């Protein structure tokens, strides 16, 4: 069994086997999964509903794809994929990946590549950015550093500019499950169903967006994919030693 059959046996839909090996003969790994969402979004495996399963199977195929097929973050890594509103600001639509605990066990690759296939897929369907609040990105400042110390220390420990500056730019809304029962300062924020620490979405910014950085600024690159221009100058910044 090869990475397009790990693909359809581990996420689905039934079908993207054939289509995934017809794909990446001419386009690719990268490619072939942009193509491969835009042919789940477009309904070439079936009229799946909602927009929500719509984005659960197009995120959950892309990243199996992306990551060969030898990691669970497509299945065991994401809780669930949601779509849910900036009530707080315009109340527009955006994209959440739910990240649960066994997220830990993919690496900071495919930790960054589930957000970047976020964005991608949240586009196609026509969703808005999340526009998080200051408490949602105070939150996460905050998040960051009680896991850090009291949970487990972070291959990659960002500053806490460095959460500022990802929270304020990554388009989806990076969240999960409660992993650790630790109670936290900033309590009750309008999308956030849990009041402890969600240990999934703080690796997956810390370990994941920022820590592979210049890994993702490739996949970047390679998909040709628009507005992550914050993110190569964060690369390129850290490289340089120029401030954030």
């Not at 990243?63 to 509103?85: D, F, H, N, Q, Y």
């Not at 976020?118 to 009680?146: A, Q, T, W």
């Not at 500056?165 to 169903?193: C, F, K, Q, W, Y």
């Amino acid at each position: 069994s090869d990475m397009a059959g790990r693909v359809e046996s581990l996420v689905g839909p039934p079908g993207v086997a054939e289509r995934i090996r017809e794909l990446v003969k001419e386009y690719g790994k990268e490619i072939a999964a942009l193509k491969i969402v835009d042919e789940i979004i477009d309904g070439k495996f079936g009229d799946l509903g909602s927009k929500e399963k719509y984005a659960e199977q197009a995120v959950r195929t892309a990243l199996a794809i992306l990551t060969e097929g030898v990691v669970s973050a497509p299945i065991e890594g994401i809780a669930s994929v949601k779509i849910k509103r900036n009530t707080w600001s315009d109340n527009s639509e955006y994209l959440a990946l739910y990240y649960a605990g066994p997220i830990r066990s993919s690496g900071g690759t495919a930790q960054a590549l589930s957000v970047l296939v976020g964005d991608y897929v949240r586009r196609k369907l026509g969703l808005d950015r999340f526009k998080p609040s200051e408490k949602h990105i105070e939150r996460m400042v905050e998040e960051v550093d009680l896991y850090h110390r009291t949970v487990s220390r972070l291959q990659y420990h960002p500053s806490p500019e460095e959460v500022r500056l990802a929270m304020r730019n990554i388009p989806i809304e990076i969240t999960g499950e409660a992993t650790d029962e630790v109670e936290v300062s900033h309590r009750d924020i309008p999308g956030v169903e849990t009041n402890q620490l969600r240990g999934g979405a703080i690796l997956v910014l810390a370990e994941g967006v920022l820590q592979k950085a210049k890994k993702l600024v490739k996949y970047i690159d390679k998909m040709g994919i628009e507005g992550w221009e914050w993110l190569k100058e964060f690369v390129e910044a850290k490289e340089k030693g120029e401030e954030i």
